[PDB]
């Protein structure tokens, strides 16, 4: 509820808007890698 | 050596093989060796 008025806490507030930005997205960028668990893979597959 | 009389008749051989596919079955006999796993075998990225 609380916002910056002064344009010196306005950077602060902006900076970290865009820092909470990038750390939730790459968050769930890279969280669709290890739920989708790519399963176990032993590499023998056939007689070749 | 320096004239044979056996060039020319494995030049005549050497066609044969490759027609029939055998000097490319033995290429891929001997140079095919374990798959060197690449570099897109990501797998897991926990951000750093
Ligand atoms: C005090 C803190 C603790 C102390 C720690 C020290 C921290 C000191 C901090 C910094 C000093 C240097 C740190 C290390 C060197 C990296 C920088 C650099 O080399 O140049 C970089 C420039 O990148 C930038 O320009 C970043 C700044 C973006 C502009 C921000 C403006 C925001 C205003 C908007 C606000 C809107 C508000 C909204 C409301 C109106 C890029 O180069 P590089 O790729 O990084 O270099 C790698 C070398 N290489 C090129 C060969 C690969
Ligand atoms: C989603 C909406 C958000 C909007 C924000 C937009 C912000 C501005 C957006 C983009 C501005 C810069 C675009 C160029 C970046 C390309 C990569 C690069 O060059 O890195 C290189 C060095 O790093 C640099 O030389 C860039 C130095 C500035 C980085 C800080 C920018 C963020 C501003 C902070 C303020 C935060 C926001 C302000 C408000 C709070 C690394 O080397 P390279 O990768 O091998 O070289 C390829 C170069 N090429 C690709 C150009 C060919």
């Given at each position: 509820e609380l916002m910056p008025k002064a344009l010196s806490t306005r950077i602060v507030g902006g900076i970290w808007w865009f820092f909470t930005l990038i750390i939730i997205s790459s968050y769930t960028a890279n969280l669709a890698a290890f739920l989708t668990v790519e399963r176990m893979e032993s590499p023998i597959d056939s007689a070749d | 050596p320096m004239g044979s009389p056996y060039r020319d008749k494995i030049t005549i051989a050497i066609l044969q093989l490759q027609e029939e596919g055998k000097l490319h079955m033995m290429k891929e006999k001997?140079?095919?060796?374990?798959?060197?796993?690449?570099?897109?075998?990501?797998?897991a990225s926990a951000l750093g």
């Open positions: - | 001997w140079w095919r060796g374990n798959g060197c796993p690449e570099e897109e075998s990501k797998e």
